[PDB]
């Protein structure tokens, strides 16, 4: 249930909440004061919060 | 539930206290201010 | 002195009527952002009367404000849009002016610098009314312009000259009584 909805939504989302790169990804999640979040690989993830 | 909930478009911090919900308060103080002043000139 | 305090006072009197007078005739109450000319959002003069647009394709262009576009909600939209409240703090205004003027001449009344006193103090009672009716009605980011600001000068100066006022009044009589 849960992940099939968040896949609704991201499809069916304007602007565009998808990305072309994980760089520009954690830019993004950035540039949002909080209005985005990124769902991305754990290992991945701790290494760019470090 | 699908095509009308699951394609479903849909499902704060309180504000500071604007001069509109207090603002009788004022017209009172200004009108008795006022009635004060009549008084006072009809004694 | 007695000389000072009234060109104290009738300095007071005028720099408030003058004060009041450009407000209630200027047009920088409100810089809001709304729209110059309609029937694309931008800065905006928005005075009393009318609300000239600023910054956008073409600036300098008024247009009334549309008051008017709940017998409660109906009565402050009638109240705001006279202006009478700032209005009649002109009016009133004046009327001490008038009085403070035949003070000098036609003098040992001692009742018309009460006048002036009472006049300059109900015309800061109708500024203050006007301010709030004002305020409330705009409740329907934001900044106050100079014009504004003038009007609540107008206000303390006002206020300040009621004071003056009936203290000069206080002593005349206390004078005549010794
Ligand atoms: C003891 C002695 C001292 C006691 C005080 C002496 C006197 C009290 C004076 C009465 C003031 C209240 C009435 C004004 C008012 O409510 O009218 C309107 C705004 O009101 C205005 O915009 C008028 C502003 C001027 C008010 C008085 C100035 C006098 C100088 C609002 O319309 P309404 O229909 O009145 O609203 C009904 C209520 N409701 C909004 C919840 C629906
Ligand atoms: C009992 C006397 C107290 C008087 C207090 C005086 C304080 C004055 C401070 C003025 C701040 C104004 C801020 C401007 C805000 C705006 O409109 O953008």
């Known amino acids: 249930a849960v992940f099939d909805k968040m896949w609704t939504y991201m499809r069916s989302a304007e ?35 470090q | 539930n699908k095509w009308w909930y699951d394609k479903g478009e849909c499902g704060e911090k309180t504000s500071a206290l604007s001069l509109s919900n207090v603002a009788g308060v004022f017209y009172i103080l200004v ?7 009549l008084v006072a000139l009809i004694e | 002195d007695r000389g000072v305090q009234m060109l104290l006072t009738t300095v007071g009197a005028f720099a408030a009527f003058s004060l009041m007078t450009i407000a209630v005739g200027t047009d920088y109450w409100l810089y809001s952002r709304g729209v110059c000319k309609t029937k694309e959002e931008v800065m905006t003069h928005s005075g009393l009367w009318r609300t000239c ?5 073409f600036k300098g262009l008024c247009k009334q404000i549309d008051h008017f576009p709940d017998t409660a909600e109906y009565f402050l939209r009638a109240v705001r ?98």
């Open chain 2, 31 to 37: 009108g008795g201010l006022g009635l004060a002043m």
């Open chain 1, 15 to 49: 602007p565009s909440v998808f990305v072309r790169t994980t760089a520009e990804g954690v830019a993004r999640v950035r540039k949002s004061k909080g209005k985005y979040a990124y769902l991305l690989e754990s290992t991945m993830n701790e290494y760019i919060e």
């Open chain 3, 53 to 57: 647009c600023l910054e956008g394709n």
């Open chain 3, 81 to 178: 849009a006279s202006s009478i409240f700032p209005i009649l703090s002109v009016i009133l205004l004046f009327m001490g002016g008038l009085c403070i003027a035949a003070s000098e001449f036609y003098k040992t009344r001692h009742n018309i610098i009460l006048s002036a006193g009472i006049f300059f103090v109900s015309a800061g009672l109708s500024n203050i009314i006007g301010i709030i009716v004002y305020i409330s009605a705009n409740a329907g980011s934001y900044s106050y312009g100079w014009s504004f600001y003038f009007g609540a000068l107008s206000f303390i100066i006002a206020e300040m000259v009621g004071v003056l006022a009936v203290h000069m009044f206080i002593d005349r009589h206390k004078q005549l009584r010794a």
